[PDB]
Design a protein around this ligand. Structure first.
Ligand code: NAI
Ligand code: FMN
Ligand code: SF4
Ligand code: SF4
Ligand code: SF4
Ligand code: FES
Ligand code: FES
Ligand code: CA
Ligand code: MG
Ligand code: MG
Ligand code: MG
Lengths: 437, 238, 179, 127
């Protein structure tokens, strides 16, 4: 056309998920044929570490961890040459409800990841990189290990890659069931053999991370995105998106929709496009959608929302945030109170125990408020309480997990206070429709 | 030296100083659980929150003063309605799942929690005063359990200030106590039974409550009923 | 002694981490014990402590932090039902009731036959194909509709290995269509 | 309703099972705590069948492999509670009219209970 890429554009090119779900996509041979470790060979011989940091920075890539932090500027933080071991970490523990886009990179194009981490590792002078996956992703755990095996066999991982004087090797560390191990800092402690409580994050993992050494951590999708960006430049990448949200994104969608799943679109396409053109439109009437993660404040199912560009800015200024691209639509047949009643009895289960405000605060007081008011036992007073509880937790827990639990509640009051008061005043339990076939 | 102004009082202080010891050096004061002398400071109990300006540009969230270094020309607010309101909320959250044994608790009147509760609790928002908002079943668990011939653990009482586990790793270096399951279900426990360290008794003095208690002297008298005699030990040369 | 048997697994897993980082080995070891024995006995923890080179207590505290590790005997197939929002909007509640009811078991108990053990879980990471169930640590059994679920049950109950049990309907990959 | 009363009627019964098992497998039964609403009831009235709020089945070292509680009189959302200490297993038994002491939907019988406690004794018990 003329300007900027934002949707169903004939000029948009599938990059990451391109080969997912194609027969035998994960073979080292499939990978070598359909493209191969060509880009990494190239760069390891030509561009320097600092150069590759630049090309990644110019692109405007931001952490698809859900954080949204300039992965370019992030690598910038690593020490240059201090004769110290450095580590790269892939965060492949994807435990955010409604968010399942990293799973399939690991299951069907693992070498795509290995390629990116070789790139990244080189950018930061990391000779050792780890992959903390979840202990629940079994196939993803096997395929990723498989691939790391045959990558060493052909010399794509080892003592002197491509004859250049850089060495890169990978290590898979499985989890064992804990949403909190997803947090960059706690993630370390978990792998390290400690109980998984986030650390004091005024001292960042670039100055001290895994075993004290300068480390850097990135999402699976972040790292994978590094490949196409080094292959076809920063300009191809910035050609898609908005003024501040460049590149493509793996938006995923669950809930009641024609065809749920993972959909690679450019950064900036609309909710209307995801839910309808690709996803196929809803199956019930919908009342609200949870835009990014579940850590994200929900928004009402309105025309003005459906026409919002899914970005690190458009949702930002809509009273929410783009999380991990995990969208979930919620039907009118279910109470928004019940919805949060659930989410919060989640953040309760997953809290680590370190803070008073999250432990006692949400996993004690908050879950039990819902409980009461969700069984038709709650007075208007229990709605007021829950309300004034939030600001005592939100600001000042230890890690953002407690934030993640209140933010969504706050929003649900800010838009659906009527469903709460209604259940409280009429001493009414939450409606229990039949939802499973 | 760095020029910090706590409330209205300005104070000199070396660069490597906590905003906490900053505020205590000034005269003023604040809640205080997890943090201890000679133990690594962390922000776990989240009670020592303060307001901070680094102009008059005030930071958007509250800072745990025990793990924040003073910057030069910094401003610390410990009196604002914003702070107190929080403080009294942190009291509230702690007592949420606490036992209710005060009279019958060896932690007499010598109990940091008891004390702080009456120091900062029960906010005065400006009709009958509401003592307790929480009205559900509390945290019932293992109670009155001797870890050793010298120590007796009360799991219900524990407020999770990380002091004891923290102390064992750092000071003597014998990891004989640590937390167990996660979330609201977590408790203190051992798998080293004997309580093997030759410095186990010291947890008895650090514990802010009456979970960990000197069993040599269970149920002798209340803390104020003792006739304290400051002296020296002559069992060895130290 | 569980690991005297397999000093080759030790060589190889300790070797993924630096000399100053043997505790890193804890997770991977517990992991093994579990897949071998179905649960972690106290002696197993006192052993692992001696290997990693730290105190029993330390290991047990770490061990109990995670959901996957069971510390009491678990059926031949320990069913882990997803419970969170997406799978709830899918029918996870009804799935759980029907399951717990038919079997007659809740958390700590094991069916009389020794083969069915039940447990709720959090978002398994495949919500587009909900409701979800993980069997032991085998790849998921996605789209557990009543029809499907009874199939999965009779299959395991009949002795077929899970990797190959015929389930009615069709279940998508990274995208799923419904009708 | 009067279900509140009938709950405690069952709470005593659970205790009875616990004391039975304890002497029958020869293991420590322990009163872990009496209702605060009873120690501090001054002249106020009180008619619950017992005074024990937290009860346990501990072992040789005194560490609990089974825990049991029941919500105080003046408390909201009342349930009785079974928790197997180190193995992260919590249970919530309520009381249905004409049905009995149920765990969501399954009858919590003397049979089903003993199973749980035996299973828990063999596994969790340190000594
Ligand atoms: N993909 C998934 O499965 C999940 C994603 N999330 C997401 O986590 C997000 C928040 O994560 P956080 O890492 O805690 O946010 P954050 O506020 O700590 O910022 C994150 C990133 O910025 C970096 N950073 C910020 N200031 C820095 C400085 N002065 N110097 C060097 N680096 C700096 C951090 O290293 C980190 O990479 C949420 O928005 C949420 O959606 C949450 C749960 C699961
Ligand atoms: C409470 C909490 C939980 C998190 N869980 C995950 C997770 O499960 N997976 C993930 O990739 N990031 C998770 N994150 C964000 C990590 O800090 C993130 O993976 C890391 O910053 C990724 O680097 P990136 O932003 O460059 O992608 C979590 C963050 C927080 C605060
Ligand atoms: S906010 Fe919750 S999960 Fe996070 S450190 Fe505190 S207790 Fe742990
Ligand atoms: S620990 Fe303190 S607050 Fe708790 S019962 Fe004992 S004296 Fe009272
Ligand atoms: S037992 Fe005492 S010192 Fe140990 S964490 Fe609990 S309150 Fe703090
Ligand atoms: S004293 Fe600062 S957080 Fe506990
Ligand atoms: S909610 Fe069940 S898999 Fe995400
Ligand atoms: Ca005991
Ligand atoms: Mg082809
Ligand atoms: Mg005793
Ligand atoms: Mg779980």
């Amino acid at each position: 056309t003329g300007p900027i890429l934002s949707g169903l554009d004939p000029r948009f090119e599938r990059t990451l998920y391109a080969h997912v779900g194609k027969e035998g996509s994960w073979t080292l041979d499939y990978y070598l044929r359909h493209g191969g470790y060509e880009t990494a060979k190239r760069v390891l011989k030509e561009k320097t570490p600092d150069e590759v940091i630049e090309e990644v920075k110019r692109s405007g890539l931001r952490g698809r961890g859900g954080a949204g932090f300039p992965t370019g500027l992030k690598w910038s933080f690593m020490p240059k040459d201090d004769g110290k071991q450095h580590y790269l970490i892939c965060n492949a523990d994807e435990s955010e409800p409604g968010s399942f886009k990293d799973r399939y990179i690991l299951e069907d194009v693992p070498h795509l990841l290995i390629e990116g981490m070789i790139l990244a590792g080189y950018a930061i002078r990391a000779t050792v990189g780890y992959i903390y996956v979840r202990g629940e992703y079994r196939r993803a755990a096997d395929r990723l290990e498989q691939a790391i095996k045959e990558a060493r066999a052909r010399g794509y991982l080892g003592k002197n890659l491509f004859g250049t004087d850089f060495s890169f090797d990978l290590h898979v560390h499985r989890g064992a069931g804990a949403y909190i191990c997803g947090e960059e800092t706690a993630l370390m402690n978990s792998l390290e053999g400690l109980r998984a409580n986030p650390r004091l994050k005024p001292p960042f993992p670039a100055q001290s991370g895994l075993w004290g050494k300068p480390t850097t951590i990135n999402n699976v999708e972040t790292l994978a995105s590094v490949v196409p960006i080094m292959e076809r430049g920063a300009d191809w990448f910035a050609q898609m998106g908005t003024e501040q949200s460049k590149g493509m994104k793996l938006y995923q969608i669950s809930g009641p929709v024609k065809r749920p799943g993972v959909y690679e679109l450019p950064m900036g396409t609309t909710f209307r496009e995801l839910i309808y053109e690709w996803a196929g439109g809803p199956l019930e009437p919908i009342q609200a959608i949870i835009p990014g993660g579940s850590s994200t404040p929900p928004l009402p199912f309105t025309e003005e929302v459906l026409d919002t560009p899914m970005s690190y800015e458009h949702l930002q200024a809509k009273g929410s945030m783009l999380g991990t691209g995990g969208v979930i639509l919620i039907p009118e047949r279910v109470s928004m109170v019940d919805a949060m009643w659930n989410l919060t009895r989640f953040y309760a289960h997953e809290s680590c125990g370190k803070c008073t405000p999250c432990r006692e605060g949400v996993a004690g007081f908050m879950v039990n408020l819902f409980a009461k008011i969700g069984t038709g036992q709650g007075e208007e007073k229990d709605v007021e309480n829950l309300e004034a509880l939030l600001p005592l937790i939100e600001g000042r827990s230890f890690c953002p997990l407690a934030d993640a639990a209140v933010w969504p509640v706050k929003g649900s009051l800010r838009h659906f206070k009527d469903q709460y008061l209604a259940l409280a005043r009429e001493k009414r339990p939450v409606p229990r429709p039949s939802l499973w076939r | 030296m760095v020029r910090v102004k706590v409330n209205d009082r300005i104070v000199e202080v070396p660069p490597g100083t906590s905003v906490m010891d900053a505020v205590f050096h000034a005269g003023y004061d604040v809640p205080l659980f997890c943090s201890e002398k000679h133990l690594s400071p962390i922000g776990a109990c989240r009670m020592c929150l303060v307001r901070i300006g680094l102009p008059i540009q005030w930071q958007p969230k509250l800072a745990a003063s025990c793990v924040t270094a003073v910057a030069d020309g910094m401003v610390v607010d410990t009196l604002s309605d914003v702070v107190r309101e929080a403080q009294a909320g942190m009291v509230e959250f702690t007592l949420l799942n606490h036992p209710l044994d005060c009279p019958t608790c060896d932690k007499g009147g010598a109990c940091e929690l008891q004390d702080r509760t009456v120091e900062y609790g029960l906010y005065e928002k400006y009709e009958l005063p509401v003592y307790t908002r929480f009205e559900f079943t509390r945290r019932h668990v293992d109670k009155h359990h001797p870890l050793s011939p010298f120590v007796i653990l009360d799991r219900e009482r524990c407020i999770h200030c990380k002091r004891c586990v923290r102390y064992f790793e750092e000071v003597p270096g014998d990891e004989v106590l640590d937390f167990i399951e996660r979330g609201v279900h977590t408790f203190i426990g051992t798998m080293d039974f004997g309580l093997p360290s030759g410095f186990s008794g010291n947890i008895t003095d650090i514990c802010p409550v009456g979970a960990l208690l000197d069993l040599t002297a269970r149920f002798r008298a209340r803390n104020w009923e003792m006739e304290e005699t400051p002296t020296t030990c002559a069992l060895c040369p130290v | 002694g569980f690991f005297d048997d397999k000093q080759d697994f030790l060589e190889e897993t300790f070797a993924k981490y630096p000399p100053e980082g043997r505790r890193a080995a804890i997770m991977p070891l517990l992991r093994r014990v579990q897949q071998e024995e179905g649960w972690i006995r106290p002696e197993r923890i006192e052993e692992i402590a001696r290997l990693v080179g730290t105190t029993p207590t330390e290991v047990m505290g770490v061990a109990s932090f995670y959901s996957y590790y069971q510390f009491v005997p678990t059926g031949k197939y320990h069913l882990q039902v997803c419970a969170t929002l997406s799978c709830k909007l899918a029918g996870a509640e009804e799935l759980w009731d029907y399951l717990t009811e038919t079997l007659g078991i809740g958390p700590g108990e094991v069916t009389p036959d020794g083969l069915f053990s039940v447990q709720k879980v959090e978002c398994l990471g495949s919500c587009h194909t909900a409701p979800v169930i993980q069997v032991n640590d085998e790849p998921y059994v996605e789209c557990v509709t009543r029809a499907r679920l009874e199939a999965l049950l009779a299959g395991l109950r009949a002795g077929k290995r899970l990797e190959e049990i015929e389930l009615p309907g069709k279940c998508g990959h990274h995208v799923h269509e419904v009708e | 309703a009067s279900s509140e009363r009938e709950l405690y009627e069952a709470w005593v019964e659970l205790l009875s099972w616990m004391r039975e098992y304890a002497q029958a497998k020869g293991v420590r039964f322990e009163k872990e705590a009496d209702f605060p609403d009873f120690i501090y009831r001054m002249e106020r009235p009180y008619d619950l069948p017992t005074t024990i709020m937290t009860a346990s089945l501990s072992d040789g070292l005194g560490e609990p492999f089974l825990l049991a509680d029941v919500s105080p009189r003046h408390a909201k959302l009342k349930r009785i509670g079974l928790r197997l200490p180190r193995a992260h297993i919590h249970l919530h038994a309520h009381y249905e009219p004409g049905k009995g002491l149920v765990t969501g939907k399954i009858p919590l019988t003397k049979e089903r209970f003993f199973a749980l406690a035996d299973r828990a004794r063999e596994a969790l018990a340190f000594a």
